A paper describes a structure:
The last steps of respiration are carried out by oxidative phosphorylation (OXPHOS) in the inner mitochondrial membrane (IMM). In its canonical form, OXPHOS involves four multi-subunit protein complexes of the electron transport chain (complexes I–IV, CI–CIV) as well as the mitochondrial ATP synthase (complex V). Complexes I–IV transfer electrons from NADH or succinate to molecular oxygen through the electron carriers quinone and cytochrome c and establish an electrochemical proton gradient across the IMM. OXPHOS complexes can exist independently, but more frequently assemble into stoichiometric higher-order assemblies called supercomplexes, whose functions have remained unclear.
Author numbering:
A (entry chain V1): 59 to 488
B (entry chain S3): 2 to 95
C (entry chain V2): 27 to 248
D (entry chain S4): 50 to 141
E (entry chain A7): 65 to 127
F (entry chain S8): 112 to 222
G (entry chain S1): 58 to 299
H (entry chain S6): 31 to 101
């Protein structure tokens, strides 16, 4: 019912980089077509188009982009206000922003200009992760090309809007992907996220009103503006609509990143574009639908689950970055989740107690339960510790660390039961 | 437990001298005035359904903050009806 | 030992450290990229530039120089360089090999690749080779998860110029050994995916999307 | 007695004490212990705790010894905000 | 492995003390409302001697 | 009596849990940092004419340093003799170390 | 309902006085004053480890969590501003469970060295654990350990006991005025101090040990001299300065 | 020295400081240790975990034993 996008309906037409990704390729593919007219149309008009386009945040939160942009102050106060574009993707399984920046950087720049115009932002900062250095060089060259051509600067186009885009790179931190942690790191401090009595739309980058927006949303902004909000709302279903690019990785035959219509069945997504599970559909054990943050799903749910915000939320999971990591019967999901917990323990900033200590405790417990050196009441205690960590931590990385363990306990509990009983029998024998 | 004769007393005892009453599992408590303590104990000892005919003890508590620092407490027992009662008043030095 | 300074005849505050002329020009540009009163925002780029210039690691002298440039107490620069993973504060080899190990790569052979690297080089984790050419370690997910297990090579040979943080994706242990041999010999291997049957971040064999020539969207009347 | 500087708990404040200024402690020649000769060495700090300064004054006036009430110092609450923690500096 | 003290905190989990100041009107209302019946009087804790042999309980052995 | 570790160092850190719990206040302790930075008691005396022989200190010890030894035939002709100190307690522990250790094992089973 | 510690509220103007509900009893509070101080005015104190009245506001310990109505998650009292008609609760099972869990996470890596710790009877971790935390410990695995730091002839440092509340990091930044102490590291193991061997030197450097809740920073001259309960305290003034 | 002479006057037997300095440092392979006092954890002191990143031996602060990392 949903899926099967055509090449004309696909937004990122250079996803694999088979054509020139620079300005000439951008003009040939249809970038910077009527940016002057789009800017002249109006900030309120752009905000209304985003609101009625059904676009939702692609960074994992899923918040409506139009409303998030409308949260900015309308009256220009003394503070200059800022746009920030989250190119710092470090959640395991997702690499969509890497491809976007590497092969369609002019789309990203035009999106930055459009978002800044629509949110009355003086300047934009693109926060690239430190690992992406070739992508950073490509984006630097694209930005220099745009500045030379006059697409950015004092006169972005025939319009009189003042806009300057700068790019700042991190130094390899996963917490820096969070909005407030990214603002703190861009200030030159440690990547420690702030609390949320001051929202970033009120006191953000330098205490000025800033808006943190994902690369995919900001890049698809000009395309949906030029092609009509109705065209974007045609794909998908209900609230969650549009075109989302999924990275299918893991034990699939031919892992790949492909842009597809929202609300496509997960099975149809896997066995049509990617190629399918390594040993057929029956070989599939568990799929993490988003990045490592969201809980996994067993083979039973993945038969009919739909890859979108709502169905994945109708089941106890989330779309997140919509990068599916599959695991067949050959691997051990307990070890996979133990490695995920180790990653979260390593990448927690360690400012707030439930995540600084709880992530390490979860990793140690998962390492113990991988071999089977635990108890039934200890897996119950692991679930209780997950609940304790979840709701009492500064940012959503506590939730991202708690969710995979909770999902593994919910779904693959008999595996842990068998491992613990087998280890108990072996200990008794020894 | 056994809060029977305490409630019966509060039902039958004259209300003139019952300054305050406390219903507790740590012991039912009567606090009265020093003028009517003798009459109150005479009523309890002699009445047929509140026969606290044995005086467990008399204690004193010092409360320097209060105007009447001394608190004189009387622990009484009713063996016929099997329950303990407490009657206390406040007195100063002089 | 990894979060405090132990004095050594190298890497102590007494040694003077300063940028070369091209690095000073780059520092000026980086500072110009940020507001004048908020020059502390450039601490990460300045530390990266110092790390490239000093052979791949950040001495406390360079730390203090960066702090002086951004006009902040040196403890802030110490905190910044300690917090982030990419900033090396101990001596590493001319080539820093980094394996992923995170679950999407671990379920594909990242552990085997790392153990093959350890066996071939003969050293352990975060330990430079006795010759000093190579230093192998792992870190968290570094993008291109969909491109099979991968290794990143940080090339600190030529210094600030010629520095390459190259990717090598879809690698097998034999391919990793071949890349290490080429790097040791001195020839730069072609970075990117190693499978000849696939396009970068694309399905193996032929592509299933964007087969035709891209065309401008029909657009909208504006 | 004011709140301890070592810890922020405020459950030991609001009480009033009579401070018998009894400092006549020496060292025992045999074992080095802290001898004393004043009966009021520790009673004011141990047993005598008053609900309020008025009660303490009433007790002191009743018992006859001269007293001098020390004014207690009270913290002042002011508005604090994490938004003011993140303030914006002016233009360069 | 299920440590949770706010539910078994028997020392502090007690209801607050309730106070009610009854006035003359309330006292008269309760006095008029209340009445005494033969079944509302306090029960008597009655006991008496039995004069039972020492070897009567278990034959003097069971203890 | 006061014990020692098998190495030979004093078992008693200066935590001052002895006189915090001693109901008769028969223990007086003063301490300062040693030469090598270790926390040790520079003065530790117990009145045997004020001790009620209740074992509160020996069960409040976090390191099993003070123990109420099995010896009880230590009647002295002088009160000053009955006023112990750290050196006498340590020599008592050294003398009765084996029996105290056996009793401590047997009772640590019952704990 | 007298304010906590007899504290006196400072109203910038009588017009600005919003009515906020704390545990059912409403109180009048200025506009920008936070939930923690709202409950302080109401008369109830909330456990806190990284909040100081003079210092700034940070959610490092996450233990001052109270349940405000119409809010899915427990909110930090020390950081959330008080809004008009806000129903705050501190004795709910949600708040009690949050406090117990945060205490457990704080104590899961705290070393078992209270008897040698100079903060015996004056340690906020001990008192708050005995007041709000549970009576047991579910942790039996390997703890973490930190090497000690030399911070001068006044501050003896045992960094195993540090709970990383950053109260002293921002004290040196704001009150002392010399920025030498800092939280350096990332994750469960993050150390505090100076990267280089830098003895902290300031006139107010003695206050660093005073604000440390745990016995991480202690007076070196008073290293192991005495406990708290032994000492009798007389309220006097100083004559060294004017 | 001064402290030992302050609490002891025998000055003929070996003080505990000299004995604990004479016992050699304990070489351990790992980066962290568990210091318990003796072979029986229940008969020693509360468990103390010691960090061994510094080159010099680290005193246990309980039954001080100077554990040193192997390499
Ligand atoms: C642990 C964690 C990881 C995050 N990773 C990313 C990321 O890889 N990319 C991103 O754009 N935002 C990331 N974020 C921030 C949120 O996705 C945030 O909502 C986003 O920057 C803005 O939302 P948007 O999707 O509407 O643009 C992360 C946040 C947390 C707490
Ligand atoms: S939940 Fe806490 S510890 Fe985790 S990264 Fe966020 S702020 Fe840091
Ligand atoms: S056994 Fe003796 S020294 Fe120990 S606590 Fe009891 S009375 Fe005090
Ligand atoms: S309780 Fe034990 S360690 Fe503490 S002072 Fe007494 S003997 Fe010493
Ligand atoms: S601060 Fe920690 S180490 Fe010191 S006594 Fe308190 S809980 Fe123990
Ligand atoms: S040393 Fe003390 S005051 Fe400083 S962060 Fe650690 S616990 Fe807080
Ligand atoms: S999981 Fe290895 S690159 Fe992302
Ligand atoms: S005191 Fe509020 S979070 Fe620590
Ligand atoms: Zn020890």
């Amino acid at each position: 019912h949903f899926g099967g996008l055509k090449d004309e309906d696909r937004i990122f037409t250079n996803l694999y980089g088979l054509h020139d990704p620079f300005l000439k390729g951008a003009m040939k593919r249809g970038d910077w077509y009527r940016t002057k007219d789009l800017v002249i149309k109006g900030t309120d008009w752009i905000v209304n188009e985003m609101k009625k386009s059904g676009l939702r945040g692609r960074g994992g939160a899923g918040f409506p982009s139009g409303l998030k942009w409308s949260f900015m102050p309308k009256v220009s106060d003394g503070r200059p206000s800022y746009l920030v574009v989250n190119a710092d993707e470090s959640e395991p399984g997702t690499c969509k922003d890497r491809e976007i920046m590497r092969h369609d950087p002019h789309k990203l720049l035009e999106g930055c200009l459009i978002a800044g115009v629509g949110m009355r932002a003086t300047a934009a900062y693109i926060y690239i992760r430190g690992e992406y250095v070739n992508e950073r060089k490509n984006l630097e060259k694209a930005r220099q090309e745009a500045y030379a051509a006059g697409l950015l600067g004092k006169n972005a186009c025939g319009s009189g809007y003042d806009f300057d885009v700068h790019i700042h790179f991190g130094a390899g931190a996963y917490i820096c992907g969070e909005e407030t942690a990214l603002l703190e790191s861009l200030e030159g401090k440690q990547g420690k996220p702030r609390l949320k009595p001051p929202f970033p739309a009120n006191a953000g980058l330098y205490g000025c009103p800033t808006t943190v927006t994902n690369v995919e949303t900001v890049a698809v902004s000009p395309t949906i503006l030029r092609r009509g909000p109705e065209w974007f709302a045609g794909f998908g279903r209900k609230n969650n609509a549009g075109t989302k690019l999924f990275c299918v990785s893991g034990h699939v035959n031919k892992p790949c990143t492909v842009e597809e219509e929202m609300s496509i069945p997960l099975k149809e997504l896997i066995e049509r574009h990617c190629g399918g599970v390594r040993g057929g559909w029956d070989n599939l054990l568990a799929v993490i639908p988003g990045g490592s943050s969201v809980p996994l799903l067993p083979k039973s749910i993945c038969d009919d689950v739909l890859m979108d915000y709502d169905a994945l939320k109708a089941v106890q999971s989330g779309l997140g970055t919509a990068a599916v990591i599959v695991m067949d019967k050959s691997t051990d999901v307990v070890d996979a989740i133990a490695r995920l917990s180790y990653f979260y323990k390593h990448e927690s900033c360690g400012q707030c107690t439930p995540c600084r200590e709880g992530t390490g405790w979860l990793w140690t417990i998962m390492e113990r339960m991988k071999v089977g050196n635990a108890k039934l009441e200890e897996i119950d205690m692991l679930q209780e510790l997950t609940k304790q960590i979840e709701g009492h931590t500064i940012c959503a990385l506590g939730d991202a660390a708690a969710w995979p363990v909770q999902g593994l306990i919910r779904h693959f509990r008999p595996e842990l039961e068998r491992r613990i009983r087998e280890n108990a029998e072996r200990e008794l024998l020894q | 437990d056994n809060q029977f004769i305490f409630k019966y007393s509060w039902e039958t005892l004259p209300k003139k001298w019952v300054k305050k009453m406390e219903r507790s599992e740590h012991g039912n408590r009567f606090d009265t005035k020093t003028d009517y303590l003798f009459q109150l104990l005479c009523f309890l000892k002699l009445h047929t359904y509140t026969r606290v005919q044995v005086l467990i003890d008399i204690c004193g508590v010092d409360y320097p903050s209060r105007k009447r620092r001394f608190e004189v407490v009387y622990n009484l027992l009713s063996t016929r009806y099997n329950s303990r009662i407490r009657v206390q008043t406040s007195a100063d030095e002089v | 030992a990894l979060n405090y300074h132990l004095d050594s005849p190298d890497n102590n505050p007494n040694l003077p450290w300063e940028f070369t002329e091209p690095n000073k020009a780059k520092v000026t540009e980086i500072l110009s990229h940020y507001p004048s009163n908020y020059k502390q925002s450039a601490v990460i780029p300045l530390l990266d530039l110092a790390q490239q210039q000093h052979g791949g690691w950040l001495p406390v002298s360079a730390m203090n120089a960066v702090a002086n440039i951004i006009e902040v107490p040196p403890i802030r620069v110490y905190e910044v360089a300690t917090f982030y993973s990419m900033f090396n504060r101990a001596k590493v080899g001319k080539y820093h090999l980094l394996v992923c190990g995170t679950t999407p790569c671990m379920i594909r052979g990242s552990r085997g690749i790392e153990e093959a690297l350890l066996k071939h080089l003969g050293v352990k984790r975060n330990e430079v080779t006795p010759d000093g050419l190579f230093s192998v370690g792992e870190m968290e997910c570094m993008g291109c998860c969909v491109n099979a297990p991968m290794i990143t090579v940080a090339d600190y040979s030529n210094g600030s110029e010629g520095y390459t943080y190259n990717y090598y994706e879809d690698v097998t242990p034999e391919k990793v050994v071949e890349i290490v041999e080429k790097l040791r010999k001195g020839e730069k291997p072609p970075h990117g995916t190693q499978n000849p049957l696939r396009i970068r971040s694309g399905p193996e064999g032929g592509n299933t999307t964007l087969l035709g020539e891209p065309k401008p969207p029909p657009c909208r009347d504006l | 007695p004011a709140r301890t500087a070592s810890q922020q708990g405020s459950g030991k404040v609001g009480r009033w004490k009579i401070n018998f200024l009894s400092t006549q402690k020496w060292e025992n020649p045999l074992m080095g212990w802290t001898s004393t000769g004043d009966p009021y060495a520790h009673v004011g700090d141990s047993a005598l705790t008053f609900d309020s300064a008025e009660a303490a004054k009433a007790f002191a006036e009743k018992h006859g010894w001269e007293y001098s009430v020390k004014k207690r110092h009270t913290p002042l609450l002011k508005v604090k905000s994490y938004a003011d923690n993140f303030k914006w500096k002016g233009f360069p | 492995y299920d440590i949770k003290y706010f539910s078994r905190d028997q020392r502090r989990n007690r209801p607050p003390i309730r106070r009610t100041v009854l006035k003359k009107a309330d006292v008269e209302k309760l006095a008029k409302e209340q009445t005494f019946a033969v079944s509302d009087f306090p029960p008597v804790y009655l006991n008496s001697a039995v004069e039972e042999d020492i070897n009567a309980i278990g034959g003097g052995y069971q203890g | 009596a006061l014990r020692r570790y098998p190495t030979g160092e004093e078992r008693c850190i200066a935590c001052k849990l002895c006189e915090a719990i001693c109901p008769a206040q028969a223990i007086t302790i003063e301490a300062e940092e040693r030469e090598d930075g270790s926390r040790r008691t520079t003065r530790y005396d117990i009145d045997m004419t004020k001790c009620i022989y209740c074992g509160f200190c020996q069960e409040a010890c976090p390191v099993d340093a003070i123990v109420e030894g099995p010896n009880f035939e230590f009647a002295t002709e002088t009160h000053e003799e009955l006023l112990y100190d750290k050196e006498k307690l340590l020599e008592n522990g050294d003398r009765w170390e084996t029996e105290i250790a056996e009793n401590l094992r047997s009772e640590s089973l019952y704990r | 309902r007298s304010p906590l510690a007899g504290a006196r509220v400072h109203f910038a103007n009588p017009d600005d006085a919003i009515e906020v509900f704390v545990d059912g009893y409403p109180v009048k509070i200025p506009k920008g004053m936070t939930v923690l101080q709202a409950c302080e005015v109401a008369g109830v104190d909330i456990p806190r480890f990284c909040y100081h009245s003079r210092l700034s506001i940070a959610g490092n310990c996450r233990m001052c969590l109270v349940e405000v109505e119409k809010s899915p998650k427990p909110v930090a009292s020390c950081a959330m501003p008080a809004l008009p008609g806000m129903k705050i609760k501190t004795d709910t099972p949600v708040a009690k469970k949050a406090r117990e869990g945060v205490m457990e996470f704080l104590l899961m890596n705290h070393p078992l060295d209270c008897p040698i710790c100079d903060q015996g009877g004056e340690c906020d971790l001990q008192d708050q654990s005995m007041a709000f935390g549970s009576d047991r410990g579910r942790f039996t695995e390997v703890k973490r350990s930190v090497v000690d730091k030399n911070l001068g002839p006044l501050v003896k440092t045992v960094m195993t006991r540090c709970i990383q509340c950053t109260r002293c990091v921002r004290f040196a930044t704001e009150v002392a005025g010399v920025q030498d102490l800092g939280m350096l590291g990332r994750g469960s193991g993050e150390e505090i101090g100076t990267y280089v061997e830098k003895l902290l030197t300031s006139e107010l450097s003695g206050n660093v040990i005073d604000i440390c809740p745990v016995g991480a920073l202690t007076s070196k001259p008073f290293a192991f001299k005495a406990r708290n309960w032994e000492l009798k305290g007389t309220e006097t003034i100083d004559v060294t300065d004017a | 020295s001064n402290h030992t002479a302050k609490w002891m006057q025998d000055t003929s037997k070996k003080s505990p400081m000299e004995l604990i300095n004479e016992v050699p440092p304990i070489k351990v392979e790992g980066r962290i240790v568990a210091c318990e006092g003796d072979t029986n954890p229940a008969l020693g002191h509360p468990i103390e975990f010691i960090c061994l990143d510094l080159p010099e031996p680290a005193v246990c602060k309980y039954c001080g034993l100077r554990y040193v990392q192997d390499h």
